[PDB]
Amino acid sequence: NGRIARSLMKLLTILERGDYDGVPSWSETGDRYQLKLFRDYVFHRVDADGKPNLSIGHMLTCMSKLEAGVDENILLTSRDNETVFVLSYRELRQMYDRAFNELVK
Amino acid sequence: LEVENGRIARSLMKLLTILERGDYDGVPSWSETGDRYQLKLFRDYVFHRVDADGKPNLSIGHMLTCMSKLEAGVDENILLTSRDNETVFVLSYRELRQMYDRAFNELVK
Amino acid sequence: MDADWDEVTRIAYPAPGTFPRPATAVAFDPIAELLWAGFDRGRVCSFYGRDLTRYTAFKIQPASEGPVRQFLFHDKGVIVLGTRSVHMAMRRGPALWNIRHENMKDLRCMSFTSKGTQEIIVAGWQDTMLVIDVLKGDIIKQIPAQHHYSIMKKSRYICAATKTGSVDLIDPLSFKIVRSWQAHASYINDMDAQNDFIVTCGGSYMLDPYVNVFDLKNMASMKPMPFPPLAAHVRLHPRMLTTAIVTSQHGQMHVVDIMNPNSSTVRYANISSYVKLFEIAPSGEALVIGDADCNIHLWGSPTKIHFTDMAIPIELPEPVLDWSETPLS
Numbered sequence: 001n002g003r004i005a006r007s008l009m010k011l012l013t014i015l016e017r018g019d020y021d022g023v024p025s026w027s028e029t030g031d032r033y034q035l036k037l038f039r040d041y042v043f044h045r046v047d048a049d050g051k052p053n054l055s056i057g058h059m060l061t062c063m064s065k066l067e068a069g070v071d072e073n074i075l076l077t078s079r080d081n082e083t084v085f086v087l088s089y090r091e092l093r094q095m096y097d098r099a100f101n102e103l104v105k
Numbered sequence: 106l107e108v109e110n111g112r113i114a115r116s117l118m119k120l121l122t123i124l125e126r127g128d129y130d131g132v133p134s135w136s137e138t139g140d141r142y143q144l145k146l147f148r149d150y151v152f153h154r155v156d157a158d159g160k161p162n163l164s165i166g167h168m169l170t171c172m173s174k175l176e177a178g179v180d181e182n183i184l185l186t187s188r189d190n191e192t193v194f195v196l197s198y199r200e201l202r203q204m205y206d207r208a209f210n211e212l213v214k
Numbered sequence: 215m216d217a218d219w220d221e222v223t224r225i226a227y228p229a230p231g232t233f234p235r236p237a238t239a240v241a242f243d244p245i246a247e248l249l250w251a252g253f254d255r256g257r258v259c260s261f262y263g264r265d266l267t268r269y270t271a272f273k274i275q276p277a278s279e280g281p282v283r284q285f286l287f288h289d290k291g292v293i294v295l296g297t298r299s300v301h302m303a304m305r306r307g308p309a310l311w312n313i314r315h316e317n318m319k320d321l322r323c324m325s326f327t328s329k330g331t332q333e334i335i336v337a338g339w340q341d342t343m344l345v346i347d348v349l350k351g352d353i354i355k356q357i358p359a360q361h362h363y364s365i366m367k368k369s370r371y372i373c374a375a376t377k378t379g380s381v382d383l384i385d386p387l388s389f390k391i392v393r394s395w396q397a398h399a400s401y402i403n404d405m406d407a408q409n410d411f412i413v414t415c416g417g418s419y420m421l422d423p424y425v426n427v428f429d430l431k432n433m434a435s436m437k438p439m440p441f442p443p444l445a446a447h448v449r450l451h452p453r454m455l456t457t458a459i460v461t462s463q464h465g466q467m468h469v470v471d472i473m474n475p476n477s478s479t480v481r482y483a484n485i486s487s488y489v490k491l492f493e494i495a496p497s498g499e500a501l502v503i504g505d506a507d508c509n510i511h512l513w514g515s516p517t518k519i520h521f522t523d524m525a526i527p528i529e530l531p532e533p534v535l536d537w538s539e540t541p542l543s
Contacts, residue, residue, distance in 0.1 A: 001108045008117035009168050012152040016125050018188045019159075024312065028273050029301065031309045043121040052122065052129075052212045054542040059118050064107050075531045076307075079127070082257055084271040085307035086529055103161045118542055213541065 004063045014099050015039055028078070032099055034085050037076035038066075038092055069093035113169070116176045123208050124148055130211065140204035146185035146194060147175070147201060178202035215457065215469045215479050222500075222519050223512040225266050227251065227259075236508045238281035242495040243292070246305050246528055247521045249502060250292060251510070252282020258294055260305070262528055264500075264519050266512060269528070272309065274301035283322055283338075284366075288331045288348055295324050300336055300346060306529055311351030317342040323366035323374070328386040335389070337363045337374065343389070357389050367407035370430045375402040379416055381428070393433060397426045404492070406458070408450035411472060413458050415445040425460050427472055439475045441468060447492035454498065463488045465503060483511055495521040 015036065020026040027033065042062045045053035065072060069090040076085040123144055129135035137145065151171040154162040174181060178199045185194040228235065239252035248269060249261045256279060259271035274282060275296040286293040291310055294301040298318050302310040322338035327345065333354070337343040339362040345354045361382060365375035371392060372384040379398040382391045397405075398416030405414045412428035415421065424438035425445045443462035451457040461467045465483035483503050491504035500514040500521050512519075 002110060002113075004107050004109050005114050005117060006165070008114065008121065009152065009165065011121065012117065012148055013161075013163065013168075016148075017153050018149065029275070029309055029312045031311070034308050039121065039125075043118065044126055054122060054212060055539045056115070056118070056542045057540060059542065060107065060109075060114070067107075073529055073531050082271060082273065083307070084259070084268075086270055086531065087306060087308065088529075103163065115542060122542065209542075 003067050004060060007063055007067050010096065010100055011039065013103070014096060028083060032095070033083070034076055034087055034092070035095060035099055037078060037083070037085065038087075040079070041074065041076055065089045066093055066096075112176050113172060116172050119205070119209050120144065120148060122212060123205075135211075140208045143185065143194065143196070143201065143204050144208060146187065147183075149188070150183065150185055174198045175202055175205065215451075215454070216515060218515045218517075219481065219513055220516055221483065221511050222264055222514050222516055223266050225261070225510050225512075226508050227261075227268075227510060228253070228508060230508075234508060236490045236506055237504055237510070239284050239295075240491045240493050240502060240504060240510075241285040241287075242493060242500070242502075242521050243305070244287050244496040244522060245289065247525055248305065248528070249510075249512075249521070250285050252285065252294065254281045256280070256282060256296055258282060258292075258303075260292075261510075264512065264514075266510065270305065270307040272303055272307050274303075274312070275299050284324055286324060286326065286334060290349075293324070293334065293348065295321055295336060297321055300324070300334075302348065302351060313346060313351060313353065315344065315353060317344060317356060322362075322364050325366040325368045325372045325374075326386075327372070327389075335372070337366065339364070339377070360391055365402065365405050367405055367412075369407040369412070370410060371407075373405065373407040373412050375405045375414075377401070379418075381405065381412060381414065383430075395428050395435065397428070398422055404447040406448055406450045408452065409455040411450060411456070411458075413439075413448045413450060413472075415448050415460075421446055421463070425458065425470075436472070437475070439470050439472065441470075446489055449492060449494040449501070452494065452496050452498045459494065459501065461489055461492055461503065465489060465505075467503075481513075483513065485509060485511060497521055497523060497525075 024030045025032045066089050071088050071090050073086050073088050126136040156162050175198050180197050180199050182197050235254050237251040241250050247263050252258050255277040256273045256275035260269040262269040274294045280297045283295040291304045299314045301312050320339040321336050324334050324336040327333040327335050335343050335345050337359055343357045343359045347354050361376045363374040367373045372386050374382045379401045381395045381397050383393040397414040399418035402416040410430040414426045421444040423442050424440050425448050426438045427436040429436050441460050443466045445460050446463040448460045456472045459469050465485040467481045469479040485505040487506040490506050494501045500519050503511045
């Protein structure tokens with residue numbers, strides 16, 4: 001099927017575009033900030049002492065739950081721990097889809 | 106059940122672990138410098154392509170071919186461009202694959 | 215009132231050791247079992263349940279634009295007032311909207327208007343008041359402020375405390391000033407308005423030995439409620455509609471009945487510094503007192519304490535043999 005590969009490519013397509021510079025929705029007060037934090041949650045994990053946690057099981061599991069839009073909640077946090085969200089994969093899937101559609105139209 | 110091609114899925118995930126990571130291993134803006142900076146422009150080239158008028162080119166065919174050439178490290182060159190549009194970089198997938206491997210290995214250590 | 219009430223929980227936020235800057239705004243959520251706190255540098259966080267466990271957190275403005283001013287609450291989420299902007303977020307954290315404008319210069323207070331929770335008006339130490347559509351996150355219209363305002367509470371009218379010890383009684387529909395009430399000689403330190411009463415603390419730096427009282431139904435001032443320790447903060451009880459709780463600057467609290475003032479109950483909150491914040495839960499079964507040492511003291515009956523009418527649990531994240539992890543390669 002290859003849904004995860006396509007979802008990974010959608011993440012790369014959606015996130016960190018140069019055109020987002022100076023756009024409020026992608027700032028820490030904007031309504032798409034959680035999309036950056038989800039990327040951090042999955043792919044920029046570290047243990048205590050700061051060593052990258054590159055566990056592939058975590059990555060594929062999170063991407064799979066995202067694709068299925070399951071009701072499970074996860075804790076998204078900024079690096080400085082001053083932003084803390086509780087979001088479901090269900091909501092995150094909807095939010096990524098919204099961001100993607102902004103690129104299509 | 107998810108069914109995925111191993112090398113393609115893994116190559117995408119490795120890119121994501123590297124890019125826009127920010128500071129790392131005592132190196133400030135590690136993700137934005139050296140080898141990692143080239144990977145940043147490569148992601149832009151593959152996934153943030155726009156045509157004239159600035160409309161996103163979202164071709165999955167283009168994305169898959171580029172990721173495949175990267176993983177295979179072919180001697181074909183590509184043209185990467187800085188975000189301010191001023192600087193152009195010429196390098197092969199072979200050379201990019203080397204930067205790619207180096208950058209990721211630094212996360213493994 | 216009750217007798218078994220006590221300090222149930224004390225937390226220090228921000229945590230000692232970074233830094234000694236207390237919350238600048240606090241409010242109990244009427245819909246979720248959450249205490250909301252706002253801080254300097256535009257930081258907000260919520261605390262869940264009787265133990266005040268940190269829940270969600272977000273920013274509402276750039277760090278340079280100072281403190282959080284006030285909270286309001288909507289079914290869709292929490293409205294947060296900053297100095298030069300207005301923010302709305304999900305209770306679970308993510309931003310819904312963020313409104314800035316040239317005429318948002320020094321905001322201090324806000325209130326719902328005549329459309330239930332659909333519309334708010336924001337104001338401050340500035341000559342303009344801005345009316346906002348909460349659902350759309352849009353400014354609807356702008357209205358001159360007759361005076362600079364520091365505090366807003368809403369009952370029958372939008373009650374707006376000025377910088378000169380007066381309260382303007384503003385019609386929520388037309389926004390005209392119906393009546394102005396000189397509650398204290400030179401300044402107002404605190405004000406609440408609930409169920410056709412206004413209550414105030416204030417002075418003539420020097421606080422008055424009473425809580426002044428205004429009858430909104432009959433539109434007349436009432437005999438002040440004596441408070442010898444000097445009244446600093448006051449809140450009306452949400453279930454006992456003629457009862458107020460008053461505290462001194464040092465945490466001496468009196469439960470008093472506006473209709474029978476001489477009858478009173480006295481409790482002492484052992485705070486290490488002076489009171490900064492004082493709020494009562496919509497349930498009337500909890501209150502918080504925050505001091506200048508960043509302590510947040512939660513009071514209530516140790517067995518019955520809860521913040522909202524429906525004390526619901528909230529959306530949270532989720533062995534002998536548990537061997538093993540494969541790194542990405």
